[PDB]
């Protein structure tokens, strides 16, 4: 009968929120999957826990922008297993199912700085305008260039990170360094997953995040 969310909200990347995000979170998650579907490929079956979960997944990136920012896909594809060079090559090519695997979901609920959900999100964010995949979501257009600016400054100090420390010690996921569309993405990881490591490190674009997303996951581990 009911799905289980007070189940599927136990989870480390949902830990933080308040109990009213909680339950406005669980609102859009029910849209979502009213207007969504989830399909499960190749044998794999998803419970309703695993479902309920990655609704609130989709849903968190726009918890405060609302389910319309997921207006660009009407499925979401779920592989059992995963398969950059050809991922990146496709998001710089829209309206497409976003593909995700289970194994890399699973990995999206605890806290770790990664989360696939929140990256495809981003990419879907970043592609809203109808605009090719810039690592620029929509925003006003006096913006653009300061946000270029400050997203460009962070994957050349993310490079110089690798280039000094090597990839496998790297604060940030090598990855994002790729391209600009992939730093956004993997920086919203970060912002979600492990905002720690990205507020200290690049303060003027956490600012244009915050003010973005219009959250704050960092002041949201304090109360
Ligand atoms: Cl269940
Ligand atoms: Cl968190
Ligand atoms: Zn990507």
């Given at each position: 009968?009911?799905?289980?969310?007070?189940?599927?909200?136990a989870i480390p990347v949902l830990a933080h929120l308040s109990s009213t995000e909680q339950h406005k979170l669980?609102?859009?998650?029910?849209?979502?999957?009213?207007?969504?579907?989830?399909?499960?490929?190749?044998?794999?079956?998803?419970?309703?826990?695993?479902?309920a979960r990655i609704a609130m997944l989709f849903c968190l990136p726009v918890l405060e922008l609302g389910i319309e920012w997921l207006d660009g896909f009407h499925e979401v594809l779920i592989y059992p297993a995963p398969f950059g060079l050809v991922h990146n090559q496709?998001?710089?090519?829209?309206?497409?199912?976003?593909?995700?695997?289970?194994?890399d979901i699973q990995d999206s609920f605890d806290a770790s700085g990664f989360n696939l959900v929140v990256?495809?999100?981003?990419?879907?964010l970043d592609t809203r305008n109808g605009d090719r995949a810039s690592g620029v979501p929509l925003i006003?257009?006096?913006?653009?260039?300061?946000?270029?600016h400050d997203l460009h400054a962070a994957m050349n100090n993310i490079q110089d990170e690798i280039d000094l420390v090597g990839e496998?010690?790297?604060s940030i996921d090598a990855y994002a360094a790729t391209?600009?569309?992939?730093?956004?993405?993997?920086?919203?990881?970060?912002?979600?997953s492990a905002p720690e490591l990205f507020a200290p490190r690049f303060p003027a674009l956490?600012?244009?995040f915050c003010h973005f997303y219009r959250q704050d996951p960092l002041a949201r581990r304090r109360e």
């Open positions: 009968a009911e799905m289980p969310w007070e189940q599927a909200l669980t609102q859009m998650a029910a849209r979502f999957l009213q207007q969504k579907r989830l399909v499960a490929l190749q044998g794999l079956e998803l419970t309703p826990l695993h479902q496709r998001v710089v090519q829209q309206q497409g199912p976003v593909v995700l695997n289970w194994l990256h495809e999100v981003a990419h879907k006003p257009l006096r913006e653009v260039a300061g946000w270029e496998s010690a790297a391209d600009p569309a992939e730093c956004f993405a993997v920086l919203s990881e970060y912002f979600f956490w600012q244009r």
